[PDB]
Design a protein around this ligand. Sequence first.
Ligand code: EQU
Ligand code: EQU
Lengths: 128, 127
Amino acid sequence: LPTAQEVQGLMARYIELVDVGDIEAIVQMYADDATVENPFGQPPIHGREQIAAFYRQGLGGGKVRACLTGPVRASHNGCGAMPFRVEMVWNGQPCALDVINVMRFDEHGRIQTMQAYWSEVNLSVREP
Amino acid sequence: MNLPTAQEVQGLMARYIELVDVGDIEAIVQMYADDATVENPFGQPPIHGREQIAAFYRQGLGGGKVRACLTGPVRASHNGCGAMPFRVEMVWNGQPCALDVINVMRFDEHGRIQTMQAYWSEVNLSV
Ligand SMILES: C[C@]12CCc3c(ccc4cc(O)ccc34)[C@@H]1CCC2=O
Ligand SMILES: C[C@]12CCc3c(ccc4cc(O)ccc34)[C@@H]1CCC2=O
């Protein structure tokens, strides 16, 4: 079960994989039975295959970047929370979306749950 | 207020940090639901209810040398929840220190905090 420093490393690695759009590697980070709520408030998605579909739809068109915008906060029970900005182009408008992800890892270092907090108030038009 | 909208969550969470920054313990307590929980740091057992929460804030802030400020926007959902990054400044071992924290909060249908989870550990403390 990852220590606080191992959670910092895994959550930063997740943002690196999203930033380069490596869909297959992101899926590998999740437990085969993980659940993702993105954005939090929506019905969850459950398991690897649904999760893969999610990342393929969100990142497969390219033109998405993601970067930490502050440090990962990590707990002593395998959990942590991080702030980051997602950049995209939405029907010609360059946009930034500010997001905080909360993750719980399992005893194999895989993401068991993820909750991404954001809504449209966190979108803005902004050059990369 | 009923269940706060995303914009209302952003305002309430920002207000909470303002009140921490000036040490207004009684106003902080009034932001929580009468039976709210606080987990601070997340990973420790929850405390329950306004008196335990008041005691916790009096212990944390009552020395008067704590400041706090947002270090990015409040993220808000459409179901009355939100998350925010901020930095707390205080003294550790005789020197000025800073601690990065993220709070995740859920508001009830009266606009009061029902649950508080403050994510941080020693990996977030710097001098
Ligand atoms: C899906 C998305 C691009 C990726 C992305 C979004 C929002 C939250 C995210 C959180 C993640 O952990 C990883 C990727 C996203 C955007 C919402 C609109 C959009 O095009
Ligand atoms: C208590 C504290 C100052 C305030 C504070 C801490 C940690 C998380 C917090 C979360 C809050 O929502 C409000 C205040 C704090 C610090 C931990 C050590 C310390 O001096």
